Amino acid sequence: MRAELNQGLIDFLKASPTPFHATASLARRLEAAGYRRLDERDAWHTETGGRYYVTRNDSSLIAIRLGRRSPLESGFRLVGAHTDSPCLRVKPNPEIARNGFLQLGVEVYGGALFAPWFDRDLSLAGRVTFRANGKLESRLVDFRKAIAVIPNLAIHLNRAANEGWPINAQNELPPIIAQLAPGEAADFRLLLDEQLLREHGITADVVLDYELSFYDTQSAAVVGLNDEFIAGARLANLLSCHAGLEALLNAEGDENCILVCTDHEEVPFLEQVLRRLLPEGDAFSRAIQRSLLVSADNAHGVHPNYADRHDANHGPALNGGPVIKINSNQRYATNSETAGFFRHLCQDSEVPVQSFVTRSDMQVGVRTVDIGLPTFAMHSIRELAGSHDLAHLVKVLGAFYASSELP
Amino acid sequence: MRAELNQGLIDFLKASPTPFHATASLARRLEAAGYRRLDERDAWHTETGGRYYVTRNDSSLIAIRLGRRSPLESGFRLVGAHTDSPCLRVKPNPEIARNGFLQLGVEVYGGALFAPWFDRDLSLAGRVTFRANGKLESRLVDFRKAIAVIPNLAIHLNRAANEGWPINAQNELPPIIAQLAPGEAADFRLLLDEQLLREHGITADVVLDYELSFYDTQSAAVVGLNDEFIAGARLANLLSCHAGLEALLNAEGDENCILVCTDHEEVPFLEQVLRRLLPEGDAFSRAIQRSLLVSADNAHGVHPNYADRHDANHGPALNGGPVIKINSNQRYATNSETAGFFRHLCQDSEVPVQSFVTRSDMQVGVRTVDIGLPTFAMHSIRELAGSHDLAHLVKVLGAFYASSELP
Amino acid sequence: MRAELNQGLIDFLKASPTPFHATASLARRLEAAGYRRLDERDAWHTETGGRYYVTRNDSSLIAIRLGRRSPLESGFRLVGAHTDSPCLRVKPNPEIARNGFLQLGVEVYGGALFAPWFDRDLSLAGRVTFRANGKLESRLVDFRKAIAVIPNLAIHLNRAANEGWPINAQNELPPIIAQLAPGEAADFRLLLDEQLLREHGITADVVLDYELSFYDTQSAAVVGLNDEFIAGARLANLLSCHAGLEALLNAEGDENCILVCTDHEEVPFLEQVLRRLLPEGDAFSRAIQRSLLVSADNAHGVHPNYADRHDANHGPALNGGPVIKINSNQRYATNSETAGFFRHLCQDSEVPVQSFVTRSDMQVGVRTVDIGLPTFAMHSIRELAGSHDLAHLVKVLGAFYASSELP
């Protein structure tokens, strides 16, 4: 699957600057493929062999493909990933006016590496809540244009820059967006009002509150001498969202398949949705003990400039296939049964597979295997992954969704 | 003057990833406007009204517009800038093969800020010297494609990351360009030999040596909510080269005008060229003491996130015009006469002008005014300047080239 | 409201030295309003228009108003607060007899500020479990009288006292209660036995175990030149409990309303109670996704003597209204929809509203808005809040409970 798979990823990442936009993008694909949307507030609706999806807070999405087999006989095959990434979010009273500039105060979301955010052309996107015609409403907004930058202090006025300093997020991260005339008031909510007009044809009476992320206007791209790598924001964790969605949509077989993409993994929806697909009593527990969750988030590749940060025996290579993550050591994480099963699926699929244990010096109750695609620069504004690995992941996720018996 | 000057800047930066490429791009524009090349190795016959340029080492360039009066009487009007910028250069035996990767060893050129170089899509460009058909030759090469990246270490594996660490250039900076093998051999010279074929049709007996810089594939761009800023690598000092050239080519009047763009700022040609424009004896000193040099670098704008790093009285603004830079501790730097003359040309041109001396706790013999366009993130891989400043500098350098005479 | 409201608070604080006493004070008010206690051990027979409350461990309480529309169509309006505060609790073998005194060993509960506990007139209260007539029983006890003090070491014997020292909880906090005329054994359980007699007229065979907090005998009070402030212990979080209860008892409309006042916030009852209010299966998830929780905890006012400890843009004022708390790094916390809904509710009730994110350098699945009354000196033994703010919160919580539409 190429190449086409990698251009698909690049398009998905571009359409998905934010968990909201990721979720909307997953949704449009689910709907083009015949999946029907359920609202949790309504009575469902639900039919053996139906394909459905449900969202929560417009930022988390569960897709459900019911098969022929009873879950009380065959369980579910669940794939889990997450729609959020570390980033910079605009504060609720954000306007900072100094030395002729307008800046926006930000809060750090997740474990963001701060340095990489400097000297990048940033735009802004996310959810805005407002009142129009007596109604409380929300829409998504994406400025698209490069409107913000967080410049570094020049080396000439910060000479031990390369010796390193403790980056103060409060002081140092606020992006510059404009210059103000001598002259003039700053109103960020008025700018969101203008953006609602331009993007949706809507005129808000009052803009109330928002969840708006800065993001890099540089698109993801295949890089390297033989196109071995992909570079881009949000590879952790939209690459897995995309892989999982692609495997669900192409899935063969008779199994009950679930794709769970949740928000806030960088900080009950699944349980609550699964309990609604089941008769109650002992059904939930019987279904779950026959099920398996493949929990897909990125792993660290052994980095050649920082090799000793890895276990010599457990250094995953980019383009070396999914990594089974061991920490034995957490409750419902990889164990011998789930690791073994996954490992056998890889060999059946002719996909190489790696191992990684989190190095010796540095809830529904479903069995799980924790897996990751090897990744460098995790939590930077621009990460690096293998250009062969999306294909490997989609293939092994497809095999999982069609798999007959678990361990 | 609007988009056109800024778009012209963006095109010039994109054609000029290296001092060699900058020189070649200035030479092509000068030839298109009728300037002819003088070879330093040969006798020159130079006339009143002539338009010439001369290069040295293919990385430095002086353009000469002779007016109707001898420089012995009317002097020269010189604008100085530089073709080089801080960057990373490939070492002469650079292949590093570890953890399945091919990396290239690099040296830091100039006072580069290291951090901003991480997680960027890099290409490579510069001079290659080789033997073809027993002839020693050189050409320029630019791979164009993003073939390299210097990944950050993931936050998970470098958790104090945001608290700063002294980046080790020898260990941390070598870019990844490919995956090998095994036991595939790596030969960078062979790779240059292929690029010589692909780009120039040239076969090459042996590739001997090279001067190659990594550079960002992301183009420069107008950014900001009201398009107030320009972001790009090499704004220091290519912005000034371009302004000077645009001023030289368009300047009214008939003065003796010189544009000097030299390599190895950031670390005799001028004197040796200008001597050859004059008769023997005392002519040189006479013309020089009637001349004035505007030495155009970039200045630090007062940064709103780091504002107390400037003098409170001498904080220049992006888009507030050229800055006259004072340093009494020189050389032949700005003095009252040269600063006065510049300040008066600005007022006549209706261009605003600023001043700047450093915080008080931080040779031909030609009189000089040291000026700069205000700039943030000097010596990063991506700096920021004002989108109105280019027009301002071109106007005033234009008035300067048209001046008779001196303060 | 007034004035009455503030005296009502002062009285509630006085009757509520412990989570057990706060719970019994809420219970008594709820019974006098006609709400009826449901026992979690029993099957419930629950009716539209009902009026109920349930306690667990005698220290958490949930009050329920059932309206005539089903929660499946209209959701619940929940307000959450907590009955506990940081304090010093008596150890299980606590008698310390030294230098002629009797002291009681203490445990620190919550993140209490130590310094403020010194040089205060303390009493003692809480739950005593004992055997009387062979049977195992609990009662609440409150000594009322100032029986304990934790004195500072004098300046003369601690001359660097004002330069700060690390207060050791084990050694420095044990309060003095008496002098032993030795004599003379020290038996705390006997003392507790005498208090049971004095306060309840029961005679106890043996005192087994207890949960006893020291607390300040100084009543809460209106302070300030214009009576702008309220000072007293436990304003975090008994102000919110009080305001919630007042809002619930006076709420207009007939919506489904919950007041949840839980123990141990400072360190499943809600979920387990809500399920019993609904039919089987899908009713729970439907009701919840239609519900909203206003989670009411004190927030930090910007302190004029320590202002830079706030974001200069998000520095909430005492008497400036409830504060909407934003922290994007929490799963079911304020979001743009719940913030916006609450912001508009305040504007519609004519109540001023503020926002707070922290400085950037510093589970039933219900949607939530986290709010707080601006406060100084949490969690001292004596905190400070605005004397207008209780009125603001009671109004806005009234409007929420009377609100048909939820975000």
Curated annotation (Swiss-Prot), chains A, B, C:
Sites where the protein binds Zn(2+): 82, 156, 379
Keyword Metal-binding: yes
InterPro entries: M18_aminopeptidase_2, Peptidase_M18, Peptidase_M18_dom2
Gene3D superfamilies: Aminopeptidase i, Domain 2, Zn peptidases
Essential cofactor(s): Zn(2+)
NCBIfam families: PRK02813.1
HAMAP family: Aminopeptidase_M18_2 (MF_00467)
Name of the protein: Probable M18 family aminopeptidase 2
UniProt organism field: Pseudomonas aeruginosa (strain ATCC 15692 / DSM 22644 / CIP 104116 / JCM 14847 / LMG 12228 / 1C / PRS 101 / PAO1)
